[PDB]
Amino acid sequence: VDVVHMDENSLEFDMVGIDAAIANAFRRILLAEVPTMAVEKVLVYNNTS
Amino acid sequence: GGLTCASAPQGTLRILEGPQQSLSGSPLQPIPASPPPQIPPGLRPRFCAFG
């Protein structure tokens, strides 16, 4: 593994010597399976906007 | 002493007022034709690959 850049909010490693199935598994995990926190419910007391 | 029919007229004149034609110049349009859409100069790529 070789990393071309690592600012904050960016990474560009290489990952030399792995198949397309494992690379695709890693890519699909980041997009859809790594957990995050986000607003689910909103209680609106007044809203004259 | 009355009015009597006189000799028949020998001719008729019909008058009308008419102006004339100018030269044919045929100036079709201020900015004429359909001017073509075209390239902005230089432009430059606005995108790069990663790595």
From Swiss-Prot, chain A:
Disulfide bonds listed in the record: none
Subcellular location field: Nucleus; Nucleus, Nucleolus; Cytoplasm, Cytosol
Similarity section: Belongs to the archaeal Rpo3/eukaryotic RPB3 RNA polymerase subunit family.
Role played: DNA-dependent RNA polymerase catalyzes the transcription of DNA into RNA using the four ribonucleoside triphosphates as substrates. Common component of RNA polymerases I and III which synthesize ribosomal RNA precursors and short non-coding RNAs including 5S rRNA, snRNAs, tRNAs and miRNAs, respectively. POLR1C/RPAC1 is part of the polymerase core and may function as a clamp element that moves to open and close the cleft.
Subunit structure: Component of the RNA polymerase I and RNA polymerase III complexes consisting of at least 13 and 17 subunits, respectively. Pol I complex consists of a ten-subunit catalytic core composed of POLR1A/RPA1, POLR1B/RPA2, POLR1C/RPAC1, POLR1D/RPAC2, POLR1H/RPA12, POLR2E/RPABC1, POLR2F/RPABC2, POLR2H/RPABC3, POLR2K/RPABC4 and POLR2L/RPABC5; a mobile stalk subunit POLR1F/RPA43 protruding from the core and additional subunits homologous to general transcription factors POLR1E/RPA49 and POLR1G/RPA34.
Connected disease: Treacher Collins syndrome 3: A form of Treacher Collins syndrome, a disorder of craniofacial development. Treacher Collins syndrome is characterized by a combination of bilateral downward slanting of the palpebral fissures, colobomas of the lower eyelids with a paucity of eyelashes medial to the defect, hypoplasia of the facial bones, cleft palate, malformation of the external ears, atresia of the external auditory canals, and bilateral conductive hearing loss.
Protein's recorded name: DNA-directed RNA polymerases I and III subunit RPAC1
Organism of this sequence: Homo sapiens (Human)
Swiss-Prot record, chain B:
Modification Phosphoserine, positions: S26, S34
Compartments where located: Nucleus, Nucleolus; Chromosome
Chain spans, region Disordered: 18-41
Comp. bias intervals (Pro residues): 29-41
Similarity comment text for this entry: Belongs to the eukaryotic RPA34 RNA polymerase subunit family.
Further remarks about this protein from its record: It is in an antisense orientation to and overlaps the gene of the DNA repair enzyme ERCC1. This gene overlap is conserved in mouse, suggesting an important biological function.
Subunit annotation: Component of the RNA polymerase I (Pol I) complex consisting of 13 subunits: a ten-subunit catalytic core composed of POLR1A/RPA1, POLR1B/RPA2, POLR1C/RPAC1, POLR1D/RPAC2, POLR1H/RPA12, POLR2E/RPABC1, POLR2F/RPABC2, POLR2H/RPABC3, POLR2K/RPABC4 and POLR2L/RPABC5; a mobile stalk subunit POLR1F/RPA43 protruding from the core and additional subunits homologous to general transcription factors POLR1E/RPA49 and POLR1G/RPA34. Forms a heterodimer with POLR1E/RPA49. Part of Pol I pre-initiation complex (PIC), in which Pol I core assembles with RRN3 and promoter-bound UTBF and SL1/TIF-IB complex.
Function: Component of RNA polymerase I (Pol I), a DNA-dependent RNA polymerase which synthesizes ribosomal RNA precursors using the four ribonucleoside triphosphates as substrates. Involved in UBTF-activated transcription, presumably at a step following PIC formation.
Full protein name: DNA-directed RNA polymerase I subunit RPA34
Taxonomic source organism: Homo sapiens
Positions spanned in the full protein: 103 to 153 of 510
